[PDB]
C-alpha cells in the first residue's frame, strides 16, 4: 500500500460578509473530500459515495451533534483570540488535524491552528507541548499545556484512533483510493524566441496525483533552469503536470512504481 492520509479541517469566520458561513468543517482522505459540515446546514454529511454506503446513519447523527458543539467552541475561541490581539471586524480561525500511514507502515500525526491564515499553534505529540508563534499564542499554549490528560488524549487520537479511522476509510474507498491510472506522457519540441528551442514534457490522465518528473542531459541532472507546471485536477478524477527546459536530453517520469524515459 502507498502512503495515505486522513485530515479534518475547520474554518471559523468572524462577522461573516453575506454568503460566507460562520463555520465550515471538511474531511479528506488523500485529496478526496469525505465529509462536510457548516453552520448553515448544521448537518454532517458524506462527500464520497463509499463513505455514505459504509457508515451507518448513527455516524452522521452523532457527529452532527459533536460538530454543532465544535462550532460553538470555535466561535468562542476566535472571540478570545480577537480580544487578545485587540482586533475588530472579520477574522479567520483554522484548524487541521490528521494522520498519515506511510508505505513502510510507519505513521505521522499533526494538529495545527491558524489565525488569519497564518500559523498560530503547532502540537508536538512527542513532547506533549504546543509551539506558539507569538505572545498571544504563548497565552493559549500555557492554558492548553496545563491539562495533562487532554494532551495524552490528543496523542492517543493522532496515533491510534486517527490511524484506525484511516484504515477503515481506505478499505471503504479502495476502488478509488488504491487504484492506479498510469500517466499519458509526451515530449513536445518547439523553436520559441529566435535561437531558442524549448522542450516540454507533458503528463496527463494519471492517478494518484503523486508523480516525479525530471529532465536529464546525457544521463545526469540538468543544472539549467527547469519550469514546472502544477499538478492540476483534470475534473475526471485524474491529474495533469509538465516540466520544461531549453537546448542528448531525456524526460524521466516516475509514477506508482513504474519508471518511464522519453529520450529527445
Amino acid at each position, epitope marked *: 500500500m502507498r502512503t495515505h492520509s486522513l485530515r479534518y479541517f475547520r474554518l471559523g469566520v468572524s462577522d461573516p460578509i453575506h454568503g460566507v458561513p460562520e463555520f465550515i468543517s471538511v474531511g479528506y482522505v488523500d485529496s478526496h473530500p469525505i465529509t462536510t459540515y457548516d453552520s448553515v446546514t448544521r448537518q454532517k454529511e458524506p462527500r464520497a459515495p463509499w463513505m455514505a454506503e459504509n457508515l451507518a446513519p448513527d*455516524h452522521w*447523527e*452523532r*457527529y452532527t*451533534q*459533536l460538530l*454543532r*458543539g*465544535w*462550532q*460553538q*467552541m470555535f466561535k468562542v475561541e476566535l472571540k478570545r483570540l480577537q480580544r487578545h490581539y485587540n482586533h475588530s471586524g472579520s477574522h479567520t480561525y483554522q484548524r487541521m488535524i490528521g494522520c498519515e500511514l506511510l508505505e513502510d507502515g510507519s505513521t505521522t500525526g499533526f494538529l495545527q491552528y491558524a489565525y488569519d491564515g497564518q500559523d498560530f499553534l503547532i502540537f508536538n505529540k512527542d513532547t506533549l507541548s504546543w509551539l506558539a508563534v507569538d505572545n498571544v499564542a504563548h497565552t493559549i499554549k500555557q492554558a492548553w499545556e496545563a*491539562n495533562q*490528560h*487532554e494532551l*495524552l*488524549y*490528543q*496523542k*492517543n*487520537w493522532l496515533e*491510534e*484512533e486517527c490511524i*484506525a*479511522w484511516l484504515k477503515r476509510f481506505l478499505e471503504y474507498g479502495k476502488d478509488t483510493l488504491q487504484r492506479t491510472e498510469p500517466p499519458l506522457v509526451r515530449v513536445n519540441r518547439k523553436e520559441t524566441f529566435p535561437g531558442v528551442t524549448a522542450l516540454f514534457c507533458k503528463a496527463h490522465g494519471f492517478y494518484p496525483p503523486e508523480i516525479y518528473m525530471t529532465w536529464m542531459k546525457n544521463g545526469e541532472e540538468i543544472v539549467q533552469e527547469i519550469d514546472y507546471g502544477d499538478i492540476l485536477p483534470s475534473g475526471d478524477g485524474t491529474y495533469q503536470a509538465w516540466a520544461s527546459i531549453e537546448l542528448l536530453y531525456s524526460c524521466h517520469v516516475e509514477h506508482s512504481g513504474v519508471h518511464m524515459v522519453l529520450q529527445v
Partner: antibody
Amino acid sequence: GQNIDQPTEMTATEGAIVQINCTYQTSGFNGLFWYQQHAGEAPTFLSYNVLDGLEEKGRFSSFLSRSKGYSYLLLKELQMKDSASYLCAVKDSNYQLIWGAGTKLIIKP
Amino acid sequence: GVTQTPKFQVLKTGQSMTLQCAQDMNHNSMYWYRQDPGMGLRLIYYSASEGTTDKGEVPNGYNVSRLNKREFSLRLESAAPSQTSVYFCASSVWTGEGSGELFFGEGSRLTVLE
C-alpha cells in the same frame, strides 16, 4: 462500544488492599474513567487513563493496559469510608460513554 | 455545581412531570441519566452545546429542553411504572474531548404508581 465488565461485588479487610478490575470491548477508545458512588449519593470522578501506565491520586491508583483491554482501580490502606460502588466507563470512537454495572466494595472492619 | 430538583417525587400513571437541572460552571454539555439496579448508567437525552439536543440510549417516554447554557430540563410526558428510577443530571465542559469528566447532580428519586 459494546461491553464493559467489572465484578458485581468485592469484600476486603480494613487496612488491606483491593484491586477492582475493568475489562472493555469497544468500537474504538478515547479513554477509561473511574467514578466513586457512595450509597444514596451522586457519582464523583476519580480517574482518567487513555495511554498505557499507572497514575496515583492519594491511596487510589488507576492503571491501564491498551493491549489487554483492561484497567484496574487499586486502593491501598483500606478505610471504612471506602465502602461504595465503583463505576468503570469507557469513551468509544464517537465519545459515547459505555458504563460498567459498577462494583460494590464492602470493607470488613 | 449541578443543581437538580426534586430530590423525591411520587407520581400516578399518566401524570406529567418536569425535572429541573442547572449548572453554574459555564459547561457546554448537559446529560440526563437513569440509574437502575444491576446495570450501568443509561443516557436518556443529552445536549452537546447550547442550541442542540439529541436522544440517548433510552429516550422513549421522555423529552428534554436545553432552555439556555445553564439549564436542561427532563420531561415525563405520561409517567409509567417502568419510569420508577433514580435520575441523574450531569454536565461536562465540552463533548468530543477524551479526558473531560462528568459532574453529577444530587439525583432525583421518582416513584410511579397506578
